Amino acid sequence: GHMEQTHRAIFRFVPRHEDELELEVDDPLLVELQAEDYWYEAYNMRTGARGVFPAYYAIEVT
Amino acid sequence: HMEQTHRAIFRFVPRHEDELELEVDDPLLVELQAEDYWYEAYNMRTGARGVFPAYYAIEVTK
């Protein structure tokens, strides 16, 4: 499927919680949902995993 | 020396019970800089304790 990258990780995020998505710096992300509590629900296009992470760990591609 | 070590730079709304809520500019006393890039802190504004993603705070050169 076409997966349009929306965001890029800028900080390493190591989950402590089951629902979280692990991030490495520069990971390309497809952010599915920017939730009102400043968590993003995303697909990590490097790892193929899905989960949530703190919004400010990723920035928009454009 | 119950003195400020960090300042929050991003809003963090917990999804998980161990987490510390942050508002931008919150002064923090970070007790543990964990190896997994989570910090355990006292929020010197709210009086709450908990963990947050390390890059949501900056050191204060105090």
DSSP assignment of B12-42 equals B--SSTTB--B-TT-EEEEEEE-TTSEEEEE
The residue type of A37 is: D
List Cα–Cα distances, B17 to A8, A41, B22, in angstroms: 27, 19, 14
CB B19 within 8 A of CB B51: yes
Method for structure elucidation? X-ray
Angstrom distance (rounded) from CA B52 to CA A24: 17
CB contact under 8 A, A13 and B37: yes
Domains and CATH numbers, chain B: 6-59 (2.30.30.40)
Closest approach of chain B CAs to the CA of A5, in angstroms? 23
Q: What is the resolution of this structure in A?
A: 1.5
User: Which of B5, B16, B12, B17 has its CA nearest to residue A38?
Assistant: B12
Residues from A contacting B (CB-CB < 8 Å) are 11-14, 16-17, 19, 37-39, 52, 54-57
Angstrom distance (rounded) from CA B43 to CA A26: 30
Angstrom distance (rounded) from CA B35 to CA A6: 29
Q: How far is CA B7 from the centre of its chain?
A: 7
Phi/psi of residue A5, nearest 5 degrees? -55, 135
CB pairs under 8 A between A and B: 39
